[PDB]
Short mmCIF file of N, CA, C and O in Angstrom, two decimals:
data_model
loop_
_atom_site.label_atom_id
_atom_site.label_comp_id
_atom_site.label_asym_id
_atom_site.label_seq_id
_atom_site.Cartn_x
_atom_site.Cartn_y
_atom_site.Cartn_z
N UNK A 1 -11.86 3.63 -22.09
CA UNK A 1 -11.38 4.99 -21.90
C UNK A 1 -10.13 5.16 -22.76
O UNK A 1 -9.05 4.59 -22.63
N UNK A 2 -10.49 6.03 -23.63
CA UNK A 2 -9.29 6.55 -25.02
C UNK A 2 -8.74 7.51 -24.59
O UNK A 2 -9.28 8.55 -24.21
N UNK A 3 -7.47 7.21 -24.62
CA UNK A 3 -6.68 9.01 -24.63
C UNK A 3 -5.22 8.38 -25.09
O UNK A 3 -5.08 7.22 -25.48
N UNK A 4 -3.95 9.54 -24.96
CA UNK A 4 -2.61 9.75 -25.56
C UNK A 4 -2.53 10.21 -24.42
O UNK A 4 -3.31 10.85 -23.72
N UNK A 5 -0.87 9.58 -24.18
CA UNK A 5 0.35 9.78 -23.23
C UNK A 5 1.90 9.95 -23.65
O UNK A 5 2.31 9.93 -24.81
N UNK A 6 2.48 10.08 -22.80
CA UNK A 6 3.99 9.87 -23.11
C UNK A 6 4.39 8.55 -22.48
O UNK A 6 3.90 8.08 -21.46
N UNK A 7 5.42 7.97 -23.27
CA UNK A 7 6.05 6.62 -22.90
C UNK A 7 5.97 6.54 -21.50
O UNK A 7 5.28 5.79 -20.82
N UNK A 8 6.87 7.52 -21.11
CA UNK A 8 7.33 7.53 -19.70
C UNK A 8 6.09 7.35 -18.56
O UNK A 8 6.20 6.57 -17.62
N UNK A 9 5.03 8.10 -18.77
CA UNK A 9 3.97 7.96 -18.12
C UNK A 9 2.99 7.07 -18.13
O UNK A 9 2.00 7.12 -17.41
N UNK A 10 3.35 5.85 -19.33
CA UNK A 10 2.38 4.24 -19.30
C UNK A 10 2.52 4.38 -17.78
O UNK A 10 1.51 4.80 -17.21
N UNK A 11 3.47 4.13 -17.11
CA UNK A 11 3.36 3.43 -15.68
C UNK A 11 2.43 4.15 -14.98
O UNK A 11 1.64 3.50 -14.28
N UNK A 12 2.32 5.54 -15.01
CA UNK A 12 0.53 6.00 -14.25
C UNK A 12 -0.56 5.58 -14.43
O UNK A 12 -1.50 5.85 -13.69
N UNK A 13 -0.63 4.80 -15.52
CA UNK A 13 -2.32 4.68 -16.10
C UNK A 13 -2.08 3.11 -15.01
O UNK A 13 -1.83 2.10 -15.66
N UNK A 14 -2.15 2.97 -13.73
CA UNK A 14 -2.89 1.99 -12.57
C UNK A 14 -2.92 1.99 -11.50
O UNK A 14 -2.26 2.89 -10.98
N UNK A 15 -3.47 1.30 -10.82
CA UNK A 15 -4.37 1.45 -9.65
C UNK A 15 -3.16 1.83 -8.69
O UNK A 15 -2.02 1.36 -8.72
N UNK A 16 -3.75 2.95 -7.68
CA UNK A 16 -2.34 2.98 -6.93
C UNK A 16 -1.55 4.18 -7.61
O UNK A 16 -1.13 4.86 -6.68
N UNK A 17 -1.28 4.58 -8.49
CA UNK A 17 0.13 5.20 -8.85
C UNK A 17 -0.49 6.65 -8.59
O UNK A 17 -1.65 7.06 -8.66
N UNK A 18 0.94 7.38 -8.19
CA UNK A 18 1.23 8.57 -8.33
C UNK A 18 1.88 9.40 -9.39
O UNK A 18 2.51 8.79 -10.26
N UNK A 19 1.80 11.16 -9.45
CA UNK A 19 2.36 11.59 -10.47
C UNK A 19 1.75 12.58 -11.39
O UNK A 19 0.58 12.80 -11.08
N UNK A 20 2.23 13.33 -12.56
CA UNK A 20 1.47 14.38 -13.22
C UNK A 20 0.27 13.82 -13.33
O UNK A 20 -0.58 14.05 -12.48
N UNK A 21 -0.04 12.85 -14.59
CA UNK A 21 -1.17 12.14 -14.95
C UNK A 21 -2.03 11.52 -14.45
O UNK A 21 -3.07 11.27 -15.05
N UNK A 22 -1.72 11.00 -12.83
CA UNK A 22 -2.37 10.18 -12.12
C UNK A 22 -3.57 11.18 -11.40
O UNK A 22 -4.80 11.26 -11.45
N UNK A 23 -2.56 11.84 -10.78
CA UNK A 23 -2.86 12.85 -10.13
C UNK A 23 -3.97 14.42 -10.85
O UNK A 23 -4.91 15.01 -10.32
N UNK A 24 -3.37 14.60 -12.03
CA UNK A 24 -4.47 15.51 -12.48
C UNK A 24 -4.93 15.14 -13.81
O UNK A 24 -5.22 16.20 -14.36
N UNK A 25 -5.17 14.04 -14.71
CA UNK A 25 -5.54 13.99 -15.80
C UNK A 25 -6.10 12.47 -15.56
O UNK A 25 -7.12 12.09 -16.12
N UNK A 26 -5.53 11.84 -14.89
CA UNK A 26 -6.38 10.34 -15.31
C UNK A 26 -6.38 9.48 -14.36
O UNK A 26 -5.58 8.56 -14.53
N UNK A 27 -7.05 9.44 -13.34
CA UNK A 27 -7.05 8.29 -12.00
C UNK A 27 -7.68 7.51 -12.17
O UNK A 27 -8.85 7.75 -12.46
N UNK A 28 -7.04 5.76 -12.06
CA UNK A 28 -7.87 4.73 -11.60
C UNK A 28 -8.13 4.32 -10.47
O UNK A 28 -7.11 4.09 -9.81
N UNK A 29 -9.30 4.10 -9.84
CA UNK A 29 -9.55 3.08 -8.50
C UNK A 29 -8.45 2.26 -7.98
O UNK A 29 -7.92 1.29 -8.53
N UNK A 30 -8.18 2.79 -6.85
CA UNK A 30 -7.41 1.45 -6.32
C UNK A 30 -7.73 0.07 -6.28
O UNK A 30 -7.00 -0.90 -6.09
N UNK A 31 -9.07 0.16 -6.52
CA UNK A 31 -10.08 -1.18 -6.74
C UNK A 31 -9.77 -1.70 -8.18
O UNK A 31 -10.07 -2.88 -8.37
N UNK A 32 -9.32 -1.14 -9.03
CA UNK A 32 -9.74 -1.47 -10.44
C UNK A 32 -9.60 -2.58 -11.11
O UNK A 32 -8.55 -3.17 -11.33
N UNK A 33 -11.05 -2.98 -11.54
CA UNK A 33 -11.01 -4.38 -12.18
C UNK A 33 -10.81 -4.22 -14.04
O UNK A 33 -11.55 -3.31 -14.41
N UNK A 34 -10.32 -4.61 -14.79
CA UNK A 34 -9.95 -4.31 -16.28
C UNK A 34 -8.89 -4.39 -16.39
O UNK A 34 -8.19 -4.84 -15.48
N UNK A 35 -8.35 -3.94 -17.67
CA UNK A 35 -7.41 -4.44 -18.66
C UNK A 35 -6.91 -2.95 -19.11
O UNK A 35 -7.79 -2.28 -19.65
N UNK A 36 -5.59 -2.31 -18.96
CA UNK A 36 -4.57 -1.63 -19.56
C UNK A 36 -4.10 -2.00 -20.91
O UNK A 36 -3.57 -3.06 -21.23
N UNK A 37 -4.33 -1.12 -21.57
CA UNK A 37 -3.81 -1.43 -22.96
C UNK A 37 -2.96 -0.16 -23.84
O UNK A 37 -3.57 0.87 -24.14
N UNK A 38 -1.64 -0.33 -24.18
CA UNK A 38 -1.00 1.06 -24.35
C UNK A 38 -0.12 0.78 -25.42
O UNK A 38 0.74 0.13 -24.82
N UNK A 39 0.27 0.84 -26.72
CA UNK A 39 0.62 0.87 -27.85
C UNK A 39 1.63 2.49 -28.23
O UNK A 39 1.09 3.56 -27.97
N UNK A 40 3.14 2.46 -28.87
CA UNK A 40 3.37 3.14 -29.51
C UNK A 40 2.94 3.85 -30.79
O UNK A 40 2.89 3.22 -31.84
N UNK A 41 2.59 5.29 -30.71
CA UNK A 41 1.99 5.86 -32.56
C UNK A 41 2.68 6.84 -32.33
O UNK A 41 2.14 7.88 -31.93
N UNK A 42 3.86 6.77 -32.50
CA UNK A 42 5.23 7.49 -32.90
C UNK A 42 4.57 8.22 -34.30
O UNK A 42 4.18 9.39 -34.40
N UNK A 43 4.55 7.02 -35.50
CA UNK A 43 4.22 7.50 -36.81
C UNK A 43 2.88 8.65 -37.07
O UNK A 43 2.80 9.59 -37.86
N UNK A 44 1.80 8.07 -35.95
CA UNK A 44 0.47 8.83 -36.03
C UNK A 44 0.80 10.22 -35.80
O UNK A 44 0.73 11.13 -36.62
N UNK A 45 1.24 10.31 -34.31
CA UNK A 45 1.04 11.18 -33.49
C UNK A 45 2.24 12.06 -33.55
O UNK A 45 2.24 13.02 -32.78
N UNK A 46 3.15 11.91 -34.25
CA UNK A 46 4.72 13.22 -34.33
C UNK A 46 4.08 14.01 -35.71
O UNK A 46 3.54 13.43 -36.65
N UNK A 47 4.26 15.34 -35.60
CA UNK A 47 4.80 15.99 -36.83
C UNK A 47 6.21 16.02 -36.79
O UNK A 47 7.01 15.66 -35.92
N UNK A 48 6.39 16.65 -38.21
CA UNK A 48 7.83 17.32 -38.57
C UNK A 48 8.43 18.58 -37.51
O UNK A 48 9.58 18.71 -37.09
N UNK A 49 7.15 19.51 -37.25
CA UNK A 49 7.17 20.55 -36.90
C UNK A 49 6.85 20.15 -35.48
O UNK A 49 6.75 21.00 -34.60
N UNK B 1 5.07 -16.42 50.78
CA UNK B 1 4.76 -17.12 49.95
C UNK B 1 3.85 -18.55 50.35
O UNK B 1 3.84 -19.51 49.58
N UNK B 2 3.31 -18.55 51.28
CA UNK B 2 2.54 -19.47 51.34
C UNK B 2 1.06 -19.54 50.57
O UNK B 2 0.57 -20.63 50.26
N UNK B 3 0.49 -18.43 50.32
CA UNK B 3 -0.47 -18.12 49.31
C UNK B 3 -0.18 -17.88 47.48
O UNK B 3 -0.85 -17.37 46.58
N UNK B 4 1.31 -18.63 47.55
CA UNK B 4 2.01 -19.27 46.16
C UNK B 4 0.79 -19.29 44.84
O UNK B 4 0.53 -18.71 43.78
N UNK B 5 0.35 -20.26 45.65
CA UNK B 5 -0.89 -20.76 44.31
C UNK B 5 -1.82 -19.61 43.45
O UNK B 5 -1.90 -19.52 42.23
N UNK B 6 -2.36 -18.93 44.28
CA UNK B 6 -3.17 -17.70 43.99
C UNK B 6 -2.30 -16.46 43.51
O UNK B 6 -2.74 -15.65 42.69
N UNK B 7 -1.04 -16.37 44.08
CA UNK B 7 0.01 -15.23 43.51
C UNK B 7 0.24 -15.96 41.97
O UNK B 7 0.10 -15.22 40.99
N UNK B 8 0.48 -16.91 41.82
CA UNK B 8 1.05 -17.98 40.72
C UNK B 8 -0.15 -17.28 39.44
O UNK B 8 0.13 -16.80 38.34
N UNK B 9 -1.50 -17.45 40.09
CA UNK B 9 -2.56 -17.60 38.82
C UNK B 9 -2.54 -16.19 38.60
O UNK B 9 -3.04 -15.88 37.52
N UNK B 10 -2.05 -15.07 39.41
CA UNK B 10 -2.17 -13.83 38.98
C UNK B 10 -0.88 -13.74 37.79
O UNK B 10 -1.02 -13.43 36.61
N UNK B 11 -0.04 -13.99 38.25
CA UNK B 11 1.12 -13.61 37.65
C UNK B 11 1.04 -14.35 35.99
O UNK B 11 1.29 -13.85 34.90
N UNK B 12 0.61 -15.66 36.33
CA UNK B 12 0.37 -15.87 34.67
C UNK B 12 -0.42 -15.16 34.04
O UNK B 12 0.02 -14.64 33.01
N UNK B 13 -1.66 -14.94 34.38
CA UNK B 13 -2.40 -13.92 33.61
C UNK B 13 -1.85 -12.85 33.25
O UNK B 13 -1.93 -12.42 32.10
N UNK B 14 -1.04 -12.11 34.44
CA UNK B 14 -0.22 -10.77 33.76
C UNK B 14 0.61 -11.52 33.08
O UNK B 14 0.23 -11.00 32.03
N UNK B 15 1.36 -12.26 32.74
CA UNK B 15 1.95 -12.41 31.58
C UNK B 15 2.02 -12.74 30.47
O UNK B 15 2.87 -12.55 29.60
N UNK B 16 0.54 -13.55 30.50
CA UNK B 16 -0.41 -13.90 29.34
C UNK B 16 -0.41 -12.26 28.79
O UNK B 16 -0.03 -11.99 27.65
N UNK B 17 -0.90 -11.16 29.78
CA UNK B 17 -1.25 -10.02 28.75
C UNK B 17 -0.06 -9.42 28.32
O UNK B 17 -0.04 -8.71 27.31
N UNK B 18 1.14 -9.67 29.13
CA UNK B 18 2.15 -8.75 29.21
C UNK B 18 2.51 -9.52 27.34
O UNK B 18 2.55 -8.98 26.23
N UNK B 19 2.69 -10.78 27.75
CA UNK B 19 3.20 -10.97 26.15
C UNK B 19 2.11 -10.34 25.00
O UNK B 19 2.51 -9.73 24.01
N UNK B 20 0.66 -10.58 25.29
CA UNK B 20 -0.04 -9.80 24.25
C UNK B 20 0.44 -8.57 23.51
O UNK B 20 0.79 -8.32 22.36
N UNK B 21 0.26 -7.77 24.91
CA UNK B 21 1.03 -6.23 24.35
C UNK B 21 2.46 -6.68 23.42
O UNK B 21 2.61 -6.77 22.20
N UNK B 22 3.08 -6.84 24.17
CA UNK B 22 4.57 -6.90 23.40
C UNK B 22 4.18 -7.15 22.16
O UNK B 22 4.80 -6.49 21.32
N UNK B 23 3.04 -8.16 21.57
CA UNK B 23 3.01 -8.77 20.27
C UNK B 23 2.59 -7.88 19.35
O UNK B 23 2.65 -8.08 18.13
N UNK B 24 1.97 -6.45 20.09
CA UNK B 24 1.79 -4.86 19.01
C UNK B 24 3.42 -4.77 18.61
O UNK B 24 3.59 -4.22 17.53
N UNK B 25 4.39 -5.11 19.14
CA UNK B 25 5.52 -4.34 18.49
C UNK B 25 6.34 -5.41 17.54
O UNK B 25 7.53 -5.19 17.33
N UNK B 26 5.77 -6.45 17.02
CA UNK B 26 5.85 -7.56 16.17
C UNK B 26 5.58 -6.99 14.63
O UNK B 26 4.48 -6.50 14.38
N UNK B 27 6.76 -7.06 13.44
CA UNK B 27 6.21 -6.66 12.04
C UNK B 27 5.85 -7.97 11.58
O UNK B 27 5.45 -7.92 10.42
N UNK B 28 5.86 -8.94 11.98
CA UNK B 28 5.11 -10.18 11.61
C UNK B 28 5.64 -9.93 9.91
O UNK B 28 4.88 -9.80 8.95
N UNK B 29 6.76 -9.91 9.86
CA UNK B 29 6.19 -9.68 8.25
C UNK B 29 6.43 -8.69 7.48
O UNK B 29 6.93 -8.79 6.36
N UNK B 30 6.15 -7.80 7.94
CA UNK B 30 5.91 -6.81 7.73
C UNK B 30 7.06 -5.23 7.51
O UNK B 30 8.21 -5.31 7.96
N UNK B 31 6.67 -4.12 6.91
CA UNK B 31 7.83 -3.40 6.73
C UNK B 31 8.15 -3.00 8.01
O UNK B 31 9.28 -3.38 8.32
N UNK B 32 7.47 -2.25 9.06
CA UNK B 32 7.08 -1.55 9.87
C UNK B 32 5.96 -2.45 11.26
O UNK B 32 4.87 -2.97 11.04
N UNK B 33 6.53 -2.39 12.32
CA UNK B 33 5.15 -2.79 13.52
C UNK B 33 4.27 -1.67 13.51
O UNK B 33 3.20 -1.92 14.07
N UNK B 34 4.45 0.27 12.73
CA UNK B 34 3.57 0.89 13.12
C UNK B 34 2.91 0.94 11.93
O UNK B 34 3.47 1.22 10.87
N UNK B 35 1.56 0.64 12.07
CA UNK B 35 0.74 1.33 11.06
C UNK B 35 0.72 2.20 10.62
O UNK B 35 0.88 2.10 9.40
N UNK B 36 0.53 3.47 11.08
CA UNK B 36 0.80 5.09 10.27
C UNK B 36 2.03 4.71 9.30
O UNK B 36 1.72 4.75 8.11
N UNK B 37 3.22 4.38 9.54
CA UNK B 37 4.27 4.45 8.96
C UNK B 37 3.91 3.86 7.94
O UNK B 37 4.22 4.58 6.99
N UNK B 38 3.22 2.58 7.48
CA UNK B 38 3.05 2.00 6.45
C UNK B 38 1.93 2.48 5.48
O UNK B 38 1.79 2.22 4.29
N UNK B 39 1.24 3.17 6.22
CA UNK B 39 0.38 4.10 5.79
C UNK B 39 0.44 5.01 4.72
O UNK B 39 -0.03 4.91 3.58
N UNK B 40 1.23 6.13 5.40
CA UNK B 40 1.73 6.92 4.89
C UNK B 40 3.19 6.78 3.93
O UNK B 40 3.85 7.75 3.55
N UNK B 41 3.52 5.33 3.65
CA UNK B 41 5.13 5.73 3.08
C UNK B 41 4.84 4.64 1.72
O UNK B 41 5.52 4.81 0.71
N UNK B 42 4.03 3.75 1.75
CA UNK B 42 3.52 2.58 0.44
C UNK B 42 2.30 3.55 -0.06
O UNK B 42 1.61 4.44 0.41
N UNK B 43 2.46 2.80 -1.38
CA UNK B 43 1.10 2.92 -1.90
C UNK B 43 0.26 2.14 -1.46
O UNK B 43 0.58 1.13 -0.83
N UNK B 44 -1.34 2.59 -1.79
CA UNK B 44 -2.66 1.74 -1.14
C UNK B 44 -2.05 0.17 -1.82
O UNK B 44 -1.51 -0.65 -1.07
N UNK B 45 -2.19 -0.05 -3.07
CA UNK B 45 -2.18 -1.60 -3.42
C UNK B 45 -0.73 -2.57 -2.22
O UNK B 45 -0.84 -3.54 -1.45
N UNK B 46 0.32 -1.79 -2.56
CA UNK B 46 1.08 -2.51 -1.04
C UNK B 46 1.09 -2.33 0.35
O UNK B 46 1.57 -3.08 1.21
N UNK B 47 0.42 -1.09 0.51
CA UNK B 47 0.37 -0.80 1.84
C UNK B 47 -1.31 -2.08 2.51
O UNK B 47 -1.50 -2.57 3.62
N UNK B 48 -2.00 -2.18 1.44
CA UNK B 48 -3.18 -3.09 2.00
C UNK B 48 -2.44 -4.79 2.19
O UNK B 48 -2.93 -5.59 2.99
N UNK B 49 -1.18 -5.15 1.28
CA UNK B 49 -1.26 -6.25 1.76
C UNK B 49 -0.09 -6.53 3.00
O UNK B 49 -0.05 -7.61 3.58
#
C-alpha cells in the first residue's frame, strides 16, 4: 500500500493509532501483520511554488 | 459455641469467597482494577496486554 504523508504523521501509519490520517485516510488492523516502510522525498515531492 | 466445628467450616468458606471478591479490586499489574477504565483510556494494542 503506496501513498504520501507528512513527517509528523509517520506515527499514524500503525496498528492502534489515532488521528487525522488514521482515522479518515488510512487505517491499519489492530491485528496487523507486515512491515512499515516510510522514507523522506523532500526533493521529489516540494515545488518552488 | 459448642457446635464450633460446623460454625468453623461455614465461616471459612465465607472467607474463602469473601477474599475471592476482594481479589476483583486487585490491578495485579495493572493500570486500573476496572476494566471500562482501561478500556476506554489505552489504545487496543496496550489496553489488550
Amino acid at each position: 500500500d503506496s501513498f504520501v504523508i507528512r513527517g509528523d504523521e509517520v506515527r499514524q501509519i500503525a496498528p492502534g493509532q489515532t488521528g487525522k490520517i488514521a482515522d479518515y485516510n488510512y487505517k491499519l488492523p489492530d491485528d496487523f501483520t507486515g512491515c512499515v516502510i516510510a522514507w523522506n522525498s523532500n526533493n521529489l515531492d516540494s515545488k518552488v511554488g | 459455641s459448642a457446635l464450633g466445628k460446623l460454625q468453623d467450616v461455614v465461616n471459612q468458606n465465607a472467607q474463602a469467597l469473601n477474599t475471592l471478591v476482594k481479589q476483583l479490586s486487585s490491578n495485579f499489574g495493572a493500570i486500573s482494577s476496572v476494566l471500562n477504565d482501561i478500556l476506554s483510556r489505552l489504545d487496543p494494542p496496550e489496553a489488550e496486554v
